[PDB]
């Protein structure tokens, strides 16, 4: 029943569980670059 | 897992993030904190005295709990663990052919950071630039090809780190379900973008009512995942105000599997290019940039200083998965 809609600025964090490392951190304020 | 290293790198990631947003608070941000941490840790291998303690404290280590040796050992162990999905990190030094380096430094650089030493004719400026960019293109599979733009002829060494990442979603989007939809740049400005969608999905999920944000995790086939944080409309500044290692940990700890009616995620590709000098100075790394720099662990002399630190990163998100790449370069002329 829940809807998740990434239609506004969001953050994305790419992580590795084995080392607990953040590989990349990102804020997307405009996906049209 | 060396918890000390893991903690320092996450703290440093969020300090860097805040400084990057401070430059231009409404623009896209993409960087690899791991690439920058590793490049600076590599630099500190050749540093002594205040230059050294400033770098290590800037990277958020507690020199009271850990020694310089244990830090380098932790990064060695990390690099070996990282290198299903595609993942690689590399370190290199490009050195003026005639420049005298201590055997202990090139041996330690190879053993701890996996770094070779490339003889480079920096006075042939354009050919040196091509050798370095070629190294980065190779390491990033063509994703980053112009990390080096200008390159002074009197450079003595350039230290480089790259990271390359390419992974498949374990629950991939079906491109048949990708449709143009609104993206609200603000409440009152919106554009149409390619919006991927997934139907009836069970993924780790957490609604943080106090912080007005929704958190979901999309796993990749490997041991890696993407944590997405979606602030409510006009709550991005509020959510950024809470970002920290403690808050991120609370996010992960609060995730529970939940069936989602539908998930909408834009398909997108972003790229950013940064000069990190101002930010590194703000984080307390100062002597490395001045005539008082002590990089004598490299050469046996206090004859080197940092002039420029640059970072480039790209992020591509699509139905099948995600591709991301970054590189960091440190330009070091004579002191
Ligand atoms: C990958 C971890 C991570 C990476 C980078 C920065 C971080 O702050 C983290 C975490 O905090 C993690 C946890 O707290 C776990 O909640 C966490 O603590 C945990 C554990 N086993 O101790 C888990 O495995 C995870 N989840 C609750 C089942 C989760 C971790 O996935 C992440």
DSSP codes of every residue in B128-148: HHHHHHHHHHHHHTTS---S-
Nearest residue on chain A to B1, alpha-carbon basis: A19
The angle at the Cα of B292, spanning B40 to B56, to the nearest 5 degrees, equals 30
Q: Do B224 and A31 touch (CB under 8 A)?
A: no
Residues 6+ apart with CB under 8 A from B271: A33, B30, B312, B313, B314, B315
Compute the distance between CA of residue B305 and CA of residue B331 in angstroms, rounded to an integer.
9
Kindly state the DSSP code that residue B25 receives in the 8-state scheme: T
The CATH number of the domain holding residue B14 is: 3.30.497.10
Query: Do residues B122 and B154 make contact, with C-beta atoms less than 8 angstroms apart?
Result: yes
Half-sphere exposure of B126 (CA within 13 A, CB side): 0
Compute the distance between CA of residue B327 and CA of residue B265 in angstroms, rounded to an integer.
26
Buried b (16+ CB within 10 A) or exposed e, B172-205: ebeeeebeebebebeeeeeeebbbbbbeebebbb
A19 part of a folded domain: yes
Buried b (16+ CB within 10 A) or exposed e, B5-23: bbbbbbbbbbbbbebbbee
Q: Is A18 in the pocket of ligand 1 (CB under 6 A)?
A: no
Query: Do residues B166 and B315 make contact, with C-beta atoms less than 8 angstroms apart?
Result: no
If asked whether residues B202 and B115 sit together in one domain, one would say no
Compute the distance between CA of residue B85 and CA of residue B222 in angstroms, rounded to an integer.
5
Strand B86-96 and strand B116-120: the pairing is: parallel
Please report where in the chains the tokens 């993942």 appear, as a residue: B87
If asked whether residues B164 and B176 sit together in one domain, one would say no
Compute the distance between CA of residue B269 and CA of residue B282 in angstroms, rounded to an integer.
30
Compute the distance between CA of residue B186 and CA of residue B286 in angstroms, rounded to an integer.
38
Closest to B266 measured CA to CA, from B164, B213, B190, B170: B190
Task: Give chain A's domain count.
Answer: 1
A1 part of a folded domain: yes
Q: Resolution in Å, one decimal, please.
A: 2.0
Query: Do residues B67 and B131 make contact, with C-beta atoms less than 8 angstroms apart?
Result: no
| Helices marked H in chain B | 3-23, 33-45, 49-58, 68-82, 103-113, 125-140, 236-242, 245-254, 277-282, 296-299
Which helix (H) or strand (E) segment is B208 a member of? strand B190-208
A17 part of a folded domain: yes
The CATH number of the domain holding residue B191 is: 2.30.39.10
Q: Between chain A and chain B, how many beta carbons pairs sit less than 8 Å apart? A: 160
Which helix (H) or strand (E) segment is B226 a member of? strand B224-231
As given in the structure block, the two tokens for residue B32 are 């690899």
> CB of B263 within 8 Å of any CB in chain A?
yes
A32 part of a folded domain: no
If asked whether residues B50 and B198 sit together in one domain, one would say no
Crossing angle, helix B3-23 and helix B68-82, to 10 degrees?
Answer: 80
Could you tell me the residue range of the domain that residue A18 belongs to?
A: 1-25
If asked whether residues B34 and B115 sit together in one domain, one would say yes
Q: How many CB atoms lie within 10 A of CB B133?
A: 20
Please choose from A20, A22, A23 the residue to mutate so as to test ligand 1's pocket, defined by most ligand atoms within 8 A of CB: A20
Which of B12, B30, B243, B313 best tests the A interface by mutation, with the highest count of A CBs <10 A?
B30
Q: Give the largest CA-CA distance in chain B.
A: 64
Displacement of CA B253 from its chain's centroid (Å): 24
Task: Give chain B's domain count.
Answer: 2
Chain B residues 156-215 with a CB less than 8 Å from chain A: 163, 165, 181-185, 191, 193, 195, 205, 214
If asked whether residues B131 and B182 sit together in one domain, one would say no
Could you tell me the residue range of the domain that residue B234 belongs to?
A: 169-265+325-335
Query: Do residues B229 and B239 make contact, with C-beta atoms less than 8 angstroms apart?
Result: yes
Q: Which residues of B touch A16 (CB under 8 A)?
A: 82, 223-224
A30 part of a folded domain: no
């Amino acid at each position: 029943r829940t809807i998740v809609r990434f239609n506004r600025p969001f953050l994305m964090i790419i992580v590795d569980h084995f080392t607990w490392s953040i590989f990349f951190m990102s804020k997307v304020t405009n996906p049209k670059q | 897992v060396d918890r000390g290293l893991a903690s320092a790198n996450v703290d440093f990631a969020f300090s860097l993030y805040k400084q990057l947003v401070l430059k231009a608070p409404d623009k896209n941000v993409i960087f690899s904190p791991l690439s920058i941490s590793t490049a600076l840790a590599f630099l500190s291998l050749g540093a002594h005295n205040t230059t050294l303690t400033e770098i290590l404290k800037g990277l958020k280590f507690n020199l009271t709990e850990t020694s310089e040796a244990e830090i380098h050992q932790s990064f060695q162990h990390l690099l070996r663990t990282l290198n299903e999905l595609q993942l690689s990190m590399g370190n290199a030094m490009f050195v003026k052919e005639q420049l005298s380096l201590l055997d202990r430094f090139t041996e330690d650089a190879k053993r701890l950071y996996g770094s070779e030493a490339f003889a480079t004719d920096f006075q042939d400026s354009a050919a040196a630039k091509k050798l370095i960019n070629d190294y980065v293109k190779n390491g990033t599979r063509g994703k980053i090809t112009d990390l080096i733009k200008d390159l002074d002829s009197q450079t003595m060494m350039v230290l480089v780190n790259y990271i390359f990442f390419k992974a498949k979603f374990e629950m991939p989007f079906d491109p048949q379900d990708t449709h143009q939809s609104r993206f609200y740049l603000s409440k009152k400005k919106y554009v149409m973008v390619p919006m991927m969608s997934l139907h009836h999905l069970t993924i780790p999920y957490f609604r943080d009512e106090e912080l007005s944000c929704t958190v979901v995790q999309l796993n990749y086939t490997g041991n890696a995942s993407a944590l997405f944080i979606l602030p409510d409309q006009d709550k991005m500044e509020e959510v950024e105000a809470m970002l920290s290692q403690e808050t991120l940990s609370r996010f992960f700890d609060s995730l529970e599997f939940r069936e989602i009616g539908e998930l909408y995620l834009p398909k997108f590709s972003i790229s950013r290019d940064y000069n990190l000098n101002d930010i590194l100075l703000q984080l307390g790394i100062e002597e490395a940039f001045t005539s008082k720099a002590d990089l004598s662990g490299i050469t046996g002399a206090r004859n080197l200083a940092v002039s420029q630190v640059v970072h480039k990163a790209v992020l591509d998100v699509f139905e099948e998965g995600t591709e991301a790449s970054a590189a960091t370069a440190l330009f070091i002329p004579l002191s």
